């Protein structure tokens, strides 16, 4: 099986460097050039350069020349991407990808690594605060607000994985503070509110923060004077 | 540099439909073009190289044509596994570039959102901030306008939106809009309202509460 295995997620401060690895299995590593392509959150694909694993020669995109270095170690079938002088704009998933290279020209990227997430930020690790989104005035919506954590990701379950239907856990959004926030909501029968308790299980592994938050119904039972 | 312009950027289609996606290169690139499929959280997968040659293992319902500047990817009969984003890529000169992508999503009937507003919790208020959450649940299509009104004054720059992908069973979207304020700013005003505009709503729906009235 021809596969490329990349190193794990990295969190870096602006000005620092990151070295991503890409190890090739199931074929002769030196027989195919290796591309590096990145993808910022929600965006498209950006080519950074490629390396000939036989000769070690590189062609690096002009945008990255002078601060990005592609190298390789034949003995362990590994290509490396060193991205130096990081800024927040380098936050992306980084991929290595092999070229078919028929006739010693680029043809297409036929095997890809799984990607390596790189986050560049001046923020420091911080576990989230979990606040209830209380259900109130035949179904009722409730949830949990998972606020002010860094870095990604967090996991949210309901009732220790027992409750799964009707759940919507939203993608995290980066705040101007540099911290992330998201909410997870669920729709349940309103008749079961006084007899069923709903707990959101928030886990943030980077900070070793586990929070179980009980979402109690609260009384918002006032209407408005209207004119129809 | 060579720019690849894809059309459309977004497509809603049904299983069994023929899907046609175009890529236009700013300069002639012969047949030095590839097409890829990408799903969330996964690397792209090669579909086509030499502009029209099907990659090994790719279902034959994918095909592509073109040489020069105008290229077309066709899915003859769209299947559930084909809802994804598609990219073209050239390799004619440096830098290699990709098109902007075409996201193919599932067509379904219009569904109006159920709108809910959540005031800040007592726990958050004592910590010094106030987040007001407006939830739009299980709607289609994705286009929606969510406006925050504070004492009937329209807000700007103090909220962020987040949207799910299509639900695996009903193909709808859900969306959160969160208004974040300091406690001092929150306590400057009384009425907090979220107004939602969507094709499935004959008129905008407003959900609101009075600060501390809960």
């Amino acid at each position: 099986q021809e596969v490329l295995v990349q190193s794990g997620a990295e969190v870096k401060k602006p000005g620092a460097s990151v070295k991503v690895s890409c190890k090739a299995f199931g074929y002769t590593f030196t027989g195919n050039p290796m591309h590096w392509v990145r993808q910022a959150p929600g965006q498209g694909l950006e080519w950074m350069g490629w390396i000939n694993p036989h000769s070690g020669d590189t062609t690096t995109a002009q945008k990255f020349q002078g601060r990005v270095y592609m190298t390789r170690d034949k003995s362990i079938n590994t290509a490396y991407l060193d991205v130096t002088r990081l800024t927040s704009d380098d936050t992306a998933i980084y991929y290595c990808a092999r070229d078919k290279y028929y006739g010693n020209e680029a043809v297409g990227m036929d095997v890809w690594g799984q990607g390596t997430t790189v986050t560049v930020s001046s923020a420091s690790t911080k576990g989230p605060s979990v606040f209830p989104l209380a259900p109130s005035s035949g179904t009722a919506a409730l949830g949990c607000l998972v606020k002010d954590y860094f870095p990604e990701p967090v996991t949210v379950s309901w009732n220790s994985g027992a409750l799964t239907s009707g759940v919507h856990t939203f993608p995290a959004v980066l705040q101007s503070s540099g911290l992330y926030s998201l909410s997870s909501v669920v729709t349940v029968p309103s008749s079961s509110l006084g007899t069923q308790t709903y707990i959101c299980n928030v886990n943030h592994k980077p900070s070793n923060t586990k929070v179980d938050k009980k979402v109690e119904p609260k009384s918002c039972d006032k209407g408005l004077e209207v004119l129809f | 540099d060579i720019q690849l312009t894809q059309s459309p950027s977004f497509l809603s289609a049904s299983v069994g439909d023929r899907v046609t996606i175009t890529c236009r290169a700013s300069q002639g690139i012969s047949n030095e073009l590839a097409w890829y499929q990408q799903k969330p959280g996964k690397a792209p997968n090669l579909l086509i190289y030499y502009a029209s040659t099907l990659q090994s293992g790719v279902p034959s319902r994918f095909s592509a044509s073109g040489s020069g500047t105008h290229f077309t990817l066709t899915i003859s009969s769209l299947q559930p596994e084909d809802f994804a984003t598609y990219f073209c890529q050239h390799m004619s000169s440096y830098p290699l570039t990709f098109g902007g992508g075409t996201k193919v999503e599932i067509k379904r009937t219009v569904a109006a959102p159920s709108v809910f507003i959540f005031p800040p919790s007592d726990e958050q208020l004592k910590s010094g901030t106030a987040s007001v959450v407006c939830l739009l649940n299980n709607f289609y299509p994705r286009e929606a306008k969510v406006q925050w009104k504070v004492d009937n004054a329209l807000q700007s720059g103090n909220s962020q939106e987040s949207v799910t992908e299509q639900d695996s069973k009903d193909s709808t979207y859900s969306l959160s809009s969160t208004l974040t304020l300091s406690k001092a700013d929150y306590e400057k005003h009384k009425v907090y309202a979220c107004e939602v505009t969507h094709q499935g709503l004959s008129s905008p729906v407003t959900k609101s509460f009075n600060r501390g009235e809960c």
Partner: peptide, 8 residues
């Protein structure tokens, strides 16, 4: 198409 020289 672009190239990067001979390989193994």
């Amino acid at each position: 198409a672009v190239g990067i020289g001979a390989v193994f």
